[PDB]
Amino acid sequence: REIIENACSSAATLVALQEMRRSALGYLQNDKEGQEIALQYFNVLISEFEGATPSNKVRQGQSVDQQGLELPQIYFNAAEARQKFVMKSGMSSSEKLDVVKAAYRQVFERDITRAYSQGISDLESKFKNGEISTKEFIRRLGKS
Amino acid sequence: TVVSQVILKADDELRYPTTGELKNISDFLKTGEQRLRIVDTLTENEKKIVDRASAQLWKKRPDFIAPGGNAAGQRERSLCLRDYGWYLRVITYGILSGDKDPIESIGLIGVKEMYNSLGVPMPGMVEAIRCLKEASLALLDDEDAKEAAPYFDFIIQAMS
Amino acid sequence: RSFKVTACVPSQTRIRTQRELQNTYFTKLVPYDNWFREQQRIMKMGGKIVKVELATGKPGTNTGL
Amino acid sequence: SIVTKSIVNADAEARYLSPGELDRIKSFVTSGERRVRIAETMTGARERIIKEAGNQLFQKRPDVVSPGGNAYGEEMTATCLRDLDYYLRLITYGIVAGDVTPIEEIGVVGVREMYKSLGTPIEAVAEGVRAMKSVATSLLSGEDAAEAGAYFDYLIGAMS
Amino acid sequence: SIVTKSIVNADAEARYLSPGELDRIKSFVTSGERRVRIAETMTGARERIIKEAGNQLFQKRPDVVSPGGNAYGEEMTATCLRDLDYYLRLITYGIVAGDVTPIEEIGVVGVREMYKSLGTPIEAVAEGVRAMKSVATSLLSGEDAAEAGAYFDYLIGAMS
Amino acid sequence: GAKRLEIAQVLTQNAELIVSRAANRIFTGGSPLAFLERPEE
Amino acid sequence: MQDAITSVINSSDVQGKYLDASAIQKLKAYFATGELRVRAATTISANAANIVKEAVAKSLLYSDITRPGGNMYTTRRYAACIRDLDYYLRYATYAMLAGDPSILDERVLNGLKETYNSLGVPIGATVQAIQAMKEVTAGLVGADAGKEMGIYFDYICSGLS
Amino acid sequence: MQDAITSVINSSDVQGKYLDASAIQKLKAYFATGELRVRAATTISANAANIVKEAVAKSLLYSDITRPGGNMYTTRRYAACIRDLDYYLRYATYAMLAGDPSILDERVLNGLKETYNSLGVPIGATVQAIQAMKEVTAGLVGADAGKEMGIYFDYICSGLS
Amino acid sequence: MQDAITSVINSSDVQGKYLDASAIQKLKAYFATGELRVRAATTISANAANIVKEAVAKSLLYSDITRPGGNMYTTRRYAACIRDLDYYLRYATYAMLAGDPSILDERVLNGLKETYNSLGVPIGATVQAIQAMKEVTAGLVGADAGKEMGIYFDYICSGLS
Amino acid sequence: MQDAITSVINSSDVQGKYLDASAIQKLKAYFATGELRVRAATTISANAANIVKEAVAKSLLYSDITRPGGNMYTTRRYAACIRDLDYYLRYATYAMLAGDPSILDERVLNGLKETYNSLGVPIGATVQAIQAMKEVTAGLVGADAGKEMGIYFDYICSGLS
Amino acid sequence: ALVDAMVDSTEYADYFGEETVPYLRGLGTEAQECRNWGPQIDLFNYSA
Amino acid sequence: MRDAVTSLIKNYDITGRYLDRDAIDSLKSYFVTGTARVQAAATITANAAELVKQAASQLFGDLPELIRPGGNAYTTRRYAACLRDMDYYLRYATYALVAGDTDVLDERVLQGLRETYNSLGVPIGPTVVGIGILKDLATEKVQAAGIEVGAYLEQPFDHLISELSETDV
Ligand SMILES: *[C@H](C)[C@H]1/C(=C/c2[nH]c(/C=C3N=C(/C=C4\NC(=O)C(CC)=C4C)C(C)=C\3CCC(=O)O)c(CCC(=O)O)c2C)NC(=O)[C@@H]1C
Ligand SMILES: *[C@H](C)[C@H]1/C(=C/c2[nH]c(/C=C3N=C(/C=C4\NC(=O)C(CC)=C4C)C(C)=C\3CCC(=O)O)c(CCC(=O)O)c2C)NC(=O)[C@@H]1C
Ligand SMILES: *[C@H](C)[C@H]1/C(=C/c2[nH]c(/C=C3N=C(/C=C4\NC(=O)C(CC)=C4C)C(C)=C\3CCC(=O)O)c(CCC(=O)O)c2C)NC(=O)[C@@H]1C
Ligand SMILES: *[C@H](C)[C@H]1/C(=C/c2[nH]c(/C=C3N=C(/C=C4\NC(=O)C(CC)=C4C)C(C)=C\3CCC(=O)O)c(CCC(=O)O)c2C)NC(=O)[C@@H]1C
Ligand SMILES: CCC1=C(C)/C(=C/C2=NC(=C\c3[nH]c(/C=C4\NC(=O)[C@H](C)[C@H]4CC)c(C)c3CCC(=O)O)/C(CCC(=O)O)=C2C)NC1=O
Ligand SMILES: CCC1=C(C)/C(=C/C2=NC(=C\c3[nH]c(/C=C4\NC(=O)[C@H](C)[C@H]4CC)c(C)c3CCC(=O)O)/C(CCC(=O)O)=C2C)NC1=O
Ligand SMILES: CCC1=C(C)/C(=C/C2=NC(=C\c3[nH]c(/C=C4\NC(=O)[C@H](C)[C@H]4CC)c(C)c3CCC(=O)O)/C(CCC(=O)O)=C2C)NC1=O
Ligand SMILES: CCC1=C(C)/C(=C/C2=NC(=C\c3[nH]c(/C=C4\NC(=O)[C@H](C)[C@H]4CC)c(C)c3CCC(=O)O)/C(CCC(=O)O)=C2C)NC1=O
Ligand SMILES: CCC1=C(C)/C(=C/C2=NC(=C\c3[nH]c(/C=C4\NC(=O)[C@H](C)[C@H]4CC)c(C)c3CCC(=O)O)/C(CCC(=O)O)=C2C)NC1=O
Ligand SMILES: CCC1=C(C)/C(=C/C2=NC(=C\c3[nH]c(/C=C4\NC(=O)[C@H](C)[C@H]4CC)c(C)c3CCC(=O)O)/C(CCC(=O)O)=C2C)NC1=O
């Protein structure tokens, strides 16, 4: 909408897409089951066009020579997200265990607990306590 | 200002500021009384500016005053007239500091999406600052018009 | 030698980069050799160190890490 | 230079060129004719500076010249005047650039590891460039000797 | 539960739950009455099938009841039936929960190293649960056996 | 997915009519669907 | 963490017994109310950029907090108080589909009591913000779900006290 | 990080008013002393291995502390002690360049008072070494700028004690 | 990564038209064969230990590759050469459910020629090991979806040799 | 390329001096053993199919490097391997006759360690072959000239390992 | 010291921070540079 | 990155010489245009967020073979990414305009750009037209701003053309 704000009318698009929705759900009056599916889906098309753009997410070089860049919020939202495994303190144990699965998977490139049956077990206990943070669990793994 | 560009630039490289920026610090600090010719002539001529630009906006784009718009009620229009002099306040922070560091961290970081949290759209409010520039630069003298013109010009790029 | 620290470190970039915010005011053992680089890193983000307490280490040795 | 340092800082935040660094650069480039007629007079009198600071060093540090010191012998004390010939030659690159990134990338960042590997005392160079400063301020006029003398004073801080 | 895996997948992505995966909760609670009837028919029928399938493990592993075996006497075999009956609640815990992790957080996290202590083999305790899932599938119907039996051969694979 | 194909199998043959329902409220002077540059077979 | 399905599983586990007749009726109450919660959570989806708007307009705007000297005066601090309000809605629908207060004791409340005093955020407007968020969605999604939505809304503001 | 320029920006912004006369009398005082502070920051950085040497050779060498028994006997304690005195001087010059001690409040005096009692570091000796480093610095830069470091050298000593 | 959904949409989208009736017939076949292979994917995922134990015994045991001089002689390489075979079983579940073997070519077949030659493992022994798994996956599943497995399954061993 | 006379010229050419009395005894030690090396080469060439026969008979034959699971096994790779062992002996005749190992470092040791990893033939068997070639040769020629032939044998073995 | 100089960097704590695991930042998750576009995805492969 | 001053430093450093008469007159030739460099760089960033918007609408009205479903500018996922990937060419042209030479363009934007676009399927062809539309649409706002114009400010741009585009002749 903020692309076509100069050429097209923003008010003409909302009234066109609403009656595009209303005439399409009038075609689905017979099945009685998919009409509420497309009413959920056309309402995404109306409500996403209601808002304006979000801003561009921007990376910054903390080194002075590495250049800063920019990325559209669209382009990050379309690609899949890497599963960020945050570990907080009092979470449950199975949800605690797949974090320390993935911490080995990040550093040692594969799950060497599952595949080689080895990994230092005293460090996980300080990790699962909430004693050391996840920054420290990487660093004491890196000096091992 | 220039001094917080240098200390935050010399802390992570763990070194004293060298002469390439110490000459750059001292060159800003001899231009205060030149910059103070610009900062009060914006100050006492504030209310002459604040509705000469506000009439300039709605004669250019009347939809914020049109019924169903944004400042169609008076409690929104009293808010929106306030935000001009708020923007005239923080621009004059920048001309005093001679840099971006007040004009970043007060009224510019994150405004592209938090007008969208409100009702006000983005690019009409870009037109509000652009008419506020010519409402101020006509009041300014010409040889110091070109100094204060990039500080108004940054707000056009960062908001759109 | 290692000592725990309570510190609250806001980021001042999560408005720009639009990341998932992790909730600070943590407690962690930082070792003695790695601490002042990590302490200076709390100052670069402007976070405020609340409490530093010596966990283990017996302050005053000449040998013994 | 300063123009690299203003771009590289503005590239890291990924914005355009600010009104801050538009005026650091413009104030640099209207001082560009002033710094080259500073830096010519160093190169115009390079045989006098090296001879006078060579006369000024060896009376301050006679452990160097005396045998068993490093610069002992007519081939070795000719190299220590050549060892100071480079640092006078580098300072003229720093005066023209307006910063010390010619000094940093060429003559600073590995000095203490090199001069430990050569046998010379490191602080004895830091007296010599300081003695090289004391004949360079007698060349120029007063308002320029504060500018060119700061580039000498940066090089002392790299050594000691 | 199957809510809990779908909640923490959305949080580790920091993503809102998409309506293409909200059907797995809607199809759960339609079958949530149906899954309780699986645990309802394993409620009153539990009290027969544990005593039978203990004998089937003794046919497959006669070294257990041998002198020098790990379950020799009365009370070594009396708790070993009770050590099997611990698992029978867990598969009925996972039917109503609908998924893996209530079996996992109670029974299968440390099972490879706790039976390593007291000497009962993992390759002995597995096929008694295969003896369990044979007779538990006998009381079920055709559709009930494929759903409830799917939790068993996970745990058989989780032993071996 | 068998239901989800049937929603598309009602909309694909009705999409040529549904723009003529849509564009006729926002456009006045010309019978617009004929102006549609549809992708040819 | 623990679902209301699994909370009866964990409490019967430390009881050590089978799923008895008291365990059915608690589990049947979640399954009889399971289709409300997915119907509740599917319409926070299309209004996730809208419920945050008027709740700010009901309890936060036209006040001293957006004035100079107020804590969300500058637009960096305005952007976080819509960001930190957007996360409190998204994590509260996780409590809706769980049917527990326990998803939110430790994903949310584990550091908020000390961060807001360290950052100088006044808690006394945040409780008014979530209570503004409680009234708007009950008139949005329906009365029966908004009764269920307001329960875990009360866990996060009393948990912020 | 608050420059004395940016400090009176922030104290004017919390009221939301423009720059008054008494605020400008802080700027035009600060714009007057610009060339003085730049001359001091050059000659410290050319002497920053000698200001840190003549402070410790005056006050701390041949004392209790360099002798065996307390706190500077081993070389790793001596390397850590000259690491602090270099870092105090490098952080004092920023407050001389800013004209505000907010660098010292943010980057130096955060964890330092707690970590010295937690390490057994004598505060009463290192409050003297910065006190000994003042009159070296007041002689090395000239007493006009020597009365400028004395605010920010003893802002450390006001905080660390 | 990609999908049979992405293969039918982007083939229609770069043409720019709507869904073809021949493009429907791919998806009408695709949603029909779900329940004939979703139930196959549960049986494959359950018996992952019994498949790999059988398939390494049908083709790789008691040979020169197990004996010294071979590449499965140490136990570190033998444990890897189970999990290197286990990932091809797991990624064959992915290309069965996605309906498209383009999950394999740039996630599991991408660096597969590079790691195997840099360690020098016989690629001709892997394909003999992988084609041994086609027999054991048919008896656990059935002849209907054993055909449906083996199309995506032989795409691994085609790109290896 | 160069020999014991050309090198001691080229050692004394790049200094700029003439042939001094410190380099003539490098020639006189060569010319004293000049008649010894020419009798050493003329028994190598008369036995050159038997030195390569007795070398592989102690290391490679009847092992399992010539097994069907082996490197040697196809007779294309056998006749190369005798010939790849021919070229180690024939140049070792040359360097003994030259008195300098420079002809070994140009043509034999050109890229030989990096060809062998690119081919897959083992290096640890090749050092076992030439050190079996060394003990056959010194028995055949004589314990004087087998010592100087043993240097140029092991100079190849220093380059392979 | 190398793992000390990288985990304590401000490049680390800005992005990952304190209580999350490191994750590799491929294309799409953030903007990616053009100078090292070649050997970054080649480094992100398992054949690294 | 590497200024016209600092390029003349290691044009003279590697041969080990001082600053002679040719060094003192080539560097003065840079400084007499430095007032014209900076004021052109202000008015390029006068409407730089508008200047990419006027260029790409003039691009895509000229080459529709990039709007209709063909080459990748199809969705707003591509189009708003296209406006960002256009905006780097405007923003880095500001830096080398001030820096004198094109060595900022040489190792920030040009290196890898033949290899980034080939990995995505982004064509190099209309990117050259996109800088070629920004070639003259930058000179308009310098001309309407009263700055003189010339090789400086019309060069950074064809160094993004003659080195990015592949050589035909
Ligand atoms: C105005 C009443 C009508 C209208 C006109 C219009 N649109 C454009 C430009 C574009 N339209 C798109 C459209 C989409 N992008 C998408 O991702 C989707 C969902 C699949 C759609 C529908 C895009 C990318 C552009 C920009 C590229 C282009 O030029 O086409 C114009 C041209 C604007 C200009 O001159 O710069 C006009 C006149 N758009 C509407 O929505 C109304 C139907
Ligand atoms: C010096 C004359 C006095 C002294 C110094 C001393 N300090 C330490 C240890 C530390 N010092 C610091 C200092 C800082 N951290 C900061 O952020 C700043 C602001 C820039 C400063 C000045 C820290 C963090 C430590 C602990 C970590 C470390 O490894 O250094 C020691 C070492 C103590 C030991 O037992 O090894 C010493 C000796 N102590 C004295 O005796 C003098 C009074
Ligand atoms: C005997 C003491 C125990 C026992 C042994 C047993 N092993 C197998 C099968 C194999 N054993 C190996 C052994 C090794 N591989 C290694 O890398 C090392 C270290 C160098 C060893 C010891 C291997 C590779 C196999 C697979 C068959 C093969 O060699 O190709 C069996 C047969 C199992 C089968 O399925 O055939 C048995 C019975 N079992 C016991 O009861 C003893 C305790
Ligand atoms: C738009 C007018 C043109 C076009 C653009 C287009 N670009 C992309 C993607 C990228 N462009 C870059 C380029 C750079 N990154 C840099 O760091 C630098 C130096 C500062 C440059 C020049 C990169 C890395 C990408 C990849 C995405 C990312 O930024 O991380 C796309 C997206 C491709 C897609 O379909 O997904 C598009 C559309 N394409 C055109 O057709 C126009 C010619
Ligand atoms: C310190 C930096 C900063 C500023 C200046 C700021 C302003 C600001 N402007 C607002 C609203 C507004 N802003 C506008 C403005 C406009 N509509 C148009 O058509 C015009 C283009 C533009 C006219 C100037 C209007 C009409 C409202 C009222 C909308 C509403 O609150 O419902 C609001 C919400 C309600 C209010 O307080 O009035 C804030 C907080 N916020 C900040 O953080
Ligand atoms: C669900 C979580 C859970 C696990 C994993 C568990 C294991 C478990 N098995 C035990 C005993 C035992 N379990 C067995 C079991 C067997 N011996 C055999 O040969 C058979 C193969 C097999 C069972 C069919 C035996 C012999 C003992 C007694 C061990 C001893 O006293 O030496 C005991 C000690 C007595 C008891 O409290 O029951 C525990 C705690 N209990 C649990 O609650
Ligand atoms: C998902 C669970 C969760 C929550 C809720 C959460 C909140 C959270 N809100 C924060 C800040 C903030 N919160 C506010 C909020 C407010 N200011 C006001 O004026 C109002 C009174 C109020 C809201 C109504 C502001 C202004 C900041 C920024 C503080 C600063 O930047 O100095 C911060 C500090 C770092 C940051 O700025 O992001 C956290 C961690 N984090 C979490 O992990
Ligand atoms: C057990 C470990 C240990 C070490 C390493 C140590 C070094 C040490 N050497 C010192 C002084 C000194 N050390 C020297 C020694 C030398 N300079 C020369 O020219 C000689 C060749 C050379 C002898 C190797 C000198 C001359 C001083 C006095 C420096 C001065 O007063 O300026 C001092 C300062 C006075 C004090 O407080 O003790 C310390 C701490 N002290 C210790 O307790
Ligand atoms: C997700 C895509 C992907 C996969 C699957 C993958 C596998 C992979 N297989 C490996 C090794 C291996 N793979 C084998 C495999 C075999 N040996 C045989 O003789 C059999 C014929 C064959 C099994 C079919 C062996 C022996 C090794 C160990 C080589 C070594 O580490 O020395 C390694 C070596 C690193 C290590 O030592 O852990 C990796 C990374 N890498 C990937 O990036
Ligand atoms: C003097 C200059 C010179 C060198 C360096 C030379 C080296 C040489 N040795 C080679 C091969 C070879 N090298 C060996 C190695 C051996 N034979 C064995 O069986 C043992 C395992 C081992 C030594 C004890 C083998 C088996 C081949 C043939 C490899 C093959 O055909 O695949 C090859 C590859 C030729 C080919 O295979 O077509 C070259 C170029 N030829 C030369 O003229």
For residues L90, L96, L97, L100, the Cα torsion angle rounded to the nearest 10 degrees is -170
- For chain I, where are the alpha helices, taking DSSP H only? 4-13, 21-32, 35-46, 48-59, 75-98, 112-119, 123-141, 143-160
The continuous run of DSSP H or E covering C3 comes out as strand C2-8
Find, among L117, L31, J48, the residue nearest to D34 by Cα.
L31
B136 Cβ neighbours under 8 A, 6+ residues apart: B42, B49, B53, B88, B148, B152
Closest CA relative to residue B112, chosen from A72, A7, K31:
A72
Give the separation between CA B6 and CA H38, rounded to whole angstroms.
12
Ligand 2 pocket, Cβ-based, cut-off 6 angstroms: C 32, 35-36, 39-40; H 60, 65, 71-72, 77, 80-81, 84-85, 87-88, 91, 108, 112, 115, 119, 121-122, 125-126, 129
Beta bridge partners of J65: none
Burial class (CB in 10 A: 0-12, 13-18, 19+), B106: buried
The DSSP code sequence of E17-57 is --TTSSHHHHHHHHSHHHHHHHHHHTTTTHHHHHHHHHHHH
Q: How far apart are CA C47 and CA L108, in angstroms?
A: 33
Contact assessment for residue I54 and residue I60, using Cβ atoms and an 8 Å cutoff: no
Contact E22/G5, CB-based, under 8 Å?
A: no
What are the residues facing C8 on neighbouring strands?
C48
Is H29 within 8 Å of chain B by CB?
no
Mutual orientation of helices I143-160 and I123-141 as an angle, nearest 10°? Answer: 170
Euclidean distance between CA atoms B48 and G82, whole angstroms = 35
D145 Cβ partners below 8 Å, 6+ apart? D136, D137, D139
Within 6 A (CB) of ligand 1 lie: A 3-4, 7-9, 12-13; L 57, 60, 67, 75-76, 79
Distance from residue J125's CA to the centre of ligand 3 (Å)? 29
Ramachandran region, residue L153 (left: φ > 0; alpha: ψ -120 to 50; beta: rest): left
Residues H111 and J75: their CA atoms lie apart, in Å, by: 77
Terminal Cα-to-Cα distance of chain K (whole angstroms): 23
Q: How many CB atoms lie within 10 A of CB H106?
A: 16
- Cα E57 to Cα E124: distance, rounded to the nearest angstrom: 8
What are the residues facing D69 on neighbouring strands? Answer: D67
**Which residues are within 8 A (CB) of D64 and not within 5 positions of it... i.e. 6 or more apart?**
D57, D58, D70, D71, D72, D80, D120, D121, D124
In chain L, residues with a C-beta closer than 8 Å to the C-beta of B150 are 42
Size of interface D-L (CB pairs under 8 A): 85
CB-facing half-sphere around the CA of G140: CA atoms within 13 A: 23
Q: Which residue has the tokens 């004017």?
A: H12
What is the amino acid identity at position I158? S
Query: What are the CB-based long-range contacts (under 8 Å, 24+) for B31-37?
Result: B31/B98, B32/H27, B32/H28, B32/H31, B33/H28, B33/H31, B34/B144, B35/B95, B35/B96, B35/B98, B35/B147, B36/B96, B36/H24, B36/H27, B36/H28, B37/B144
Cβ neighbours of residue L167 closer than 8 Å, sequence gap 6 or more? none
In terms of Cα–Cα distance, which of H74, H143, H107 is closest to H1?
H107
The closest alpha carbon to B110, from L47, L49, C18, belongs to C18
For residue K18, the chain C residues in CB contact (below 8 A) are: 9, 22, 24, 26
Q: Which residue minimizes the CA distance to atom 39 of ligand 7? A: C23
The contacts of residue J32 (CB under 8 Å, 6+ apart) are none
Name the residue of I50, I59, I60, I61 whose CB sits within 8 Å of the most ligand 3 atoms, as the mutation to test its pocket: I61
CB A63 within 8 A of CB K11: yes
Structure tokens at H43: 């000659």
Q: Could you tell me how far CA I118 lies from the centroid of its own chain? A: 22
Across H110-132, b (16+ Cβ under 10 Å) vs e yields: bbbebbbebbebeeebbbebbeb
DSSP H/E element including G21: helix G21-32
Give φ, ψ of J13 to 5 degrees. Answer: -85, -45
Q: Is B54 in the pocket of ligand 5 (CB under 6 A)?
A: no
What are the b/e assignments for B66-82, b being 16+ CB within 10 Å?
Answer: eeebbbeeeebbebbee
Closest listed residue to residue C24, CA positions, set G111, H110, K21: G111
I123-141 and I48-59 are packed helices; what angle lies between their axes, rounded to 10 degrees? Answer: 130
Written in H, E and C, the secondary structure of chain A is CCCCCCCCCHHHHHHHHHHHHHHHHHCCCCCCCCHHHHHHHHHHHHHHHHCCCCCCECCCCCCCCCCCCCECHHHHHHCCCCCCCECCCCCCHHHHHHHHHHHHHHHCCCCHHHHHCCCCHHHHHHHHCCCCCHHHHHHHHHCC
Q: C-alpha distances in angstroms, G113 versus A85, C25, C26, F31?
A: 23, 9, 12, 63
Cα separation, D115 vs D108, in Å, equals: 11
Residue J63: count of CB within 10 angstroms of its CB = 12
J30, with CB counted inside 10 A (0-12, 13-18, 19+), is middle
Burial H53-83 (b: 16+ CB within 10 A, else e): bbbbeebbeeeebbeeeebbeeeebbeebbe
Please, are residues B19 and D151 in contact by the beta-carbon 8 Å criterion?
A: yes
Q: For residue L86, list chain A residues with Cβ-Cβ distance below 8 A.
A: none
Residue among E13, E19, E105 minimizing CB distance to A81:
E13
10 Å Cβ neighbour count for A136? 22
d(CA I18, CA I24) in angstroms, rounded, equals 10
D154's CB contacts (< 8 A; 6+ apart) are: B18, B19, D94, D100, D103, H45, H46
Atom of ligand 1 nearest to the CA of L61: 29
DSSP string computed for K1-48: -HHHHHHTSHHHHHHT-SSB------BTTB---STTSHHHHHHHSTT-
Q: How large is the C-alpha radius of gyration of chain L? A: 18
Q: Which residue from A43, A51, A92 is facing G1, i.e. has the nearest CB? A: A92
Token pair 């053992």: residue:
C29
* CA-based R_g, chain F, Å: 13
Indicate which of A67, A135, A143 best probes the interface with K, i.e. most K CBs within 10 Å of its own CB: A135
**Which protein residues are within 6 Å of ligand 4, measured from CB?**
A 69, 71; K 27, 31-34; L 56, 66, 71-73, 78, 81-82, 85-86, 88, 108-109, 113, 116, 120, 122-123, 126-127, 130
Ligand 6 neighbour E80 (Cβ under 6 A):
yes
CA distance I52 to B94: 69
CA gap I88, I52 in Å, rounded: 10
Q: What is the CA radius of gyration of chain H?
A: 18
Contact B50 CB / ligand 5 (< 6 Å): no
Task: Name the minimum distance, in Å, from the CA of A55 to any CA of chain B.
Answer: 6
CB contact under 8 A, G106 and A47: no
Residue E141 main-chain phi, psi, to 5 deg: -90, -165
DSSP annotation of L100: S
Chain-chain contact of D153 with H48 (C-beta, under 8 angstroms)? no
Instruction: Examine chains D and G and say if they touch (3+ CB pairs below 8 A).
Output: no
What whole-number distance in Å separates Cα of residue D61 and Cα of residue D123?
A: 10
**Cα distance between residue H84 and residue H111, in whole Å:** 13
Task: Spell out which residues line ligand 9, taking CB within 6 angstroms.
Answer: I 60, 65, 71-72, 77, 80-81, 84-85, 87, 108, 111, 115, 119, 121, 125-126, 129; K 46
Contact (Cβ atoms closer than 8 angstroms) between residue B18 and residue D100 = yes
Using the Cβ of G79 and the Cβ atoms of chain B, whether some distance falls under 8 Å is answered with yes
Please give the DSSP secondary-structure letter assigned to residue H46: T
d(C-alpha A96, C-alpha L29), whole Å? 66
Resolution in A: 3.5
CB D54 within 8 A of CB D125: no
N- to C-terminal Cα separation, chain G: 23
d(CA E65, CA E58): 7
The rounded distance, in Å, linking the Cα atoms of G160 and C8 is 17
Q: Note whether B12 contacts C16, CB cutoff 8 Å.
A: no
A5/B123 touch (CB, cutoff 8 Å), yes or no: yes
Name the residue facing G35 among E10, E29, E46 (closest C-beta): E29
Q: How far apart are CA J91 and CA J95, in angstroms?
A: 6
**Are C29 and A136 an interchain contact pair (Cβ–Cβ within 8 Å)?**
yes
The whole-angstrom distance between L120's CA and the closest CA on chain B is 28
Find chains touching chain F: ≥3 CB pairs under 8 Å.
A, I
Q: Between helices G143-158 and G123-141, what is the axis angle to 10°?
A: 170
Spatial distance between the Cα atoms of H92 and H95, rounded to a whole number of angstroms:
5
Q: What is the CA I71 to chain-centroid distance, rounded?
A: 23
Subunit contact C14:G83, Cβ cutoff 8 A: yes
Helix (H) or strand (E) holding D132: helix D123-136
Alpha-carbon distances, residue A131 vs A86, A91, C25, C27, C37 (angstroms): 15, 14, 13, 7, 20
Tokens of I69: 């001089």
Which of I62, I84, I115, I156 to mutate to test ligand 9, by most ligand atoms within 8 A of the CB atom? I84
Chain H closest CA to B2's CA: distance in Å? 10
Q: Which 120-139 residues of chain A touch chain K by CB within 8 A? A: 133-135, 138-139
Measure the N-to-C terminal CA separation of chain H; round to a whole number of Å.
Answer: 23
In G, which residues are within 8 Å of E26 by CB distance?
A: 34-35, 38
What DSSP string describes H129-159? Answer: HHHHHHHHHHHHS-HHHHHHHHHHHHHHHHH
Across the beta sheet with C48-56, the strand order is C26-31, C2-8, C48-56
Whether J contacts F, i.e. 3 or more CB pairs less than 8 A apart, is: no
